[model samples]
Target chain A: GPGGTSVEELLEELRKLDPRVEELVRELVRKLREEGDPDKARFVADDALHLLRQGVSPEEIERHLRELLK
Target chain B: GPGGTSVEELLEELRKLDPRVEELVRELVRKLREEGDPDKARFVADDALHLLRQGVSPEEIERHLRELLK
Candidate 1:
């Protein structure tokens, strides 16, 4: 249970999202690695989770993801 | 010139997709790196572009990405 969240918790969170949303979140992790900056990834991940909790559509979340990348 | 498609051509093709789709493609590249298998990544990239050309939605592409990853 390290890294600020447990794997089970993350998986549970993942289970709540639609498959597309789960795919998008995984995409964020990959993008973070490509960006070579864990902090930025963390910020975006937090922002994504906030949006997800607010019931944002996968499309909208994707828009937000693009904005974050830009 | 070097790869199957030139970067310019690829970017142009990318421009036709929603940002989420683009992000997913980039994610595939990262996953390929993580998997350390260039050929598999190339296959997925080709499959992705084919799907994109078929007018598939970003969500569908992400599904394919997940399948390829698995």
Candidate 2:
């Protein structure tokens, strides 16, 4: 999600989540809407759902979350 | 955009579309810029308008050609 347009990137964003993750996610969604890139926007939205439904590995997301949280 | 800023990460970068999302994002940019956090710079930029219109939810947005193309 961090500059990643690939499905892997969206998957990476989905990987990072916590209690406050949703709040952060909402903001991320907000910003992409502003980007005005329809392909990217749609991709991002779809990516979010992918993560929500399938999600990335807990270890991966947790590690990143810990790094960011700290 | 991986080495630079991409689209999806922009929202979480802002913190749930809250006013502080910008302040935080700008700070992230500045810090990353200072540290040369290239992965986040342009990706964040790509999402500015999305955040602008997404003040509350992603449902809010401008019907730009790129957007309405759907």
Candidate 3:
């Protein structure tokens, strides 16, 4: 995530749910960067927060994030 | 879902992944009926299919449906 970006906050909230979330998200963010789709990774991270706000459980959303990486 | 509706197929695909999906879906359907939000339930069911088509795994989508009924 870029400096002073909200992705830091998004990653922080997700961290409270799953301790390993930062690791997975970092890998995802890095992968997207390698693919030259930096903004897509941001969209993916933002949508994860949306699901959490919509009452989707952390456990489930984490699994969804894993699926996205696959 | 209405008769011969795509929800039957959606429920079918969901059932293939989780054997107990039918029971949960029936509970959700009945609960929605009790609330008088018939169309909302259909919209929910249809969106599940859309997600599945968009590469969302069945397990994750089922979790999303569960969130909706919560």
Candidate 4:
């Protein structure tokens, strides 16, 4: 989450869910980053980061990831 | 994962980790299904399903998802 967000911030927001979910999110973001398509990759990260910032539930964020990845 | 596996078997394997990871895997498989490129989607789903069957830790499975998603 180098796009003006720390993994810690993401973790803090994700702590609303189970720790396993948090770990998955962290890995998902890392995978998107490693995917090496900056536009799509950054957008995916920002999309989740924004949703988390809006206090969206982890389950909602999970569902929303479909659109982002697609 | 309609490819020779049931979501129930997936859940049983996933329960080795926190239940939240199980939910994410379920949703992820659903998203891949909805994405509907059967070749790739089934491949991705099957890959995870296989790893889970091997008793891989959730953390390791999370890392391996990068290759599948990419």
lDDT of 3: 0.57
Clash pairs, candidate 1, are: none
Residue A17's lDDT within candidate 4 is 43
Best-to-worst ranking by DockQ: 2, 3, 4, 1
- lDDT string for model 1 (B10-67, tens) is 4346656655666677677667658664434444454456567667888877775564
Please write out the lDDT profile of model 2 over residues B1-70, one tens digit for every residue: 3232333466455445554555544554565577663433333433444445445333232222113223
Highest-TM-score candidate: 1
Q: What is the CAPRI rating of model 2's predicted complex?
A: incorrect
Per-model C-alpha lDDT, please?
0.57, 0.42, 0.57, 0.54
**What is the per-residue lDDT of model 3 for residues A1-70, given as tens digits with 9 covering 90 to 100?**
2432355676677666654655567667778779875544554555465565556765676676554444
What does the lDDT read for residue B56 in candidate 3? 69
**Pairs of colliding residues, candidate 3:** none
Q: Residue by residue across A14-69, what tens digits does model 2's lDDT show? A: 44643343444445555656765434444443334333444554344334332221
| Model 2 lDDT, residue A30, Cα | 58
lDDT of 4 by residue, A1-70 (tens): 2333344555656556455546656667678658664434333443455456556676786775553354
| Model with the higher DockQ, candidate 1 or 2 | 2
Q: Which 10 consecutive positions of candidate 1 chain A have the poorest summed lDDT? A: A1-10
Error of 1 at A53 (Å): 1.4
TM-score of each: 0.40, 0.28, 0.36, 0.35
